[PDB]
């Protein structure tokens, strides 16, 4: 299929408490993201 429609909140929003969405996901135990950066310009 495609993706959620900006006009239909039910397709992307939630009523699950954010803390519980963070949980069952990661956000506290998940290590901070790291990118590999060069050195030029």
């Amino acid at each position: 299929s495609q993706s959620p429609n900006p006009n239909n909140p039910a397709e992307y929003c939630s009523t699950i408490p954010p803390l519980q969405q963070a949980q069952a996901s990661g956000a506290l135990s998940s290590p901070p993201p790291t990118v590999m950066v060069p050195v030029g310009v």
Binding site: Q2, S3, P4, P6, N7, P9, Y12, C13, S14, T15, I16, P17, P18, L19, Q21, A22, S25, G26, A27, L28, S30, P32, P33, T34, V35, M36, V37, P38, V39, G40, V41
Partner: protein
């Protein structure tokens, strides 16, 4: 010269309130994981940005009606880099988040809606991280472009763009703009490393 890792900010976001084209009040700097932006006349605190008493000499009738409807407003959460927006207001809040847009494959200027009692992850740091990852390969330019992803616009009752009467954010009566300092600080460290 080495990797550049994300650093949790001391002040996760700075919120600027606006009434149409008018910047109203001063910047709120979120130092706590939670924070509410509402239309109440209570004193503001580390976790509360009360807009109720913010005066604007250019406040017209429309803005006055919209402000009366903000009510409980929006509760913003920063949970390990992820940012959520919850509509506590009885009226919906419209969000223009480049991060969500990129996520849902929406037009970069798409504005969605968060109905009362609902929430939306307006910022996913993992996604921004992956985006930053591919951006360091597109050179300096693209990396600096990410500055756009670190900003979110939100209107309290009326929407804008796409087929709404109002097209630009400046056209809505009550709106705020968030600057995710975490991602911005990360961008700065990446740019200085280049």
């Amino acid at each position: 010269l080495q990797p550049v890792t994300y650093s949790e900010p001391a002040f996760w976001c700075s919120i600027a309130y606006y009434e149409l084209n008018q910047r109203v009040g001063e910047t709120f700097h979120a130092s706590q994981p939670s924070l509410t932006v509402d239309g109440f006349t209570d004193p503001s605190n580390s976790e509360r940005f009360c807009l109720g008493l913010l005066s604007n000499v250019n406040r017209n009738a429309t803005v006055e009606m919209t402000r009366r409807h903000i009510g409980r407003g929006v509760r913003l959460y920063y949970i390990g880099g992820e940012v959520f927006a919850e509509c506590l207001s009885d009226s919906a809040i419209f969000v223009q988040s480049p991060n969500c847009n990129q996520r849902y494959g929406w037009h970069p200027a798409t504005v969605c809606k968060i109905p009362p009692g609902c929430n939306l992850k307006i910022f996913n740091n993992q996604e921004f991280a992956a985006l930053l990852a591919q951006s360091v390969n597109q050179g300096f330019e693209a990396v600096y472009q990410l500055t756009r992803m670190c900003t979110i616009r939100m209107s309290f009752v009326k929407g804008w763009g796409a087929e709404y009467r109002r097209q630009t954010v400046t056209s809505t009566p009550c709106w705020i703009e968030l600057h995710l300092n975490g991602p911005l600080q990360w961008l700065d460290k990446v740019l200085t490393q280049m």
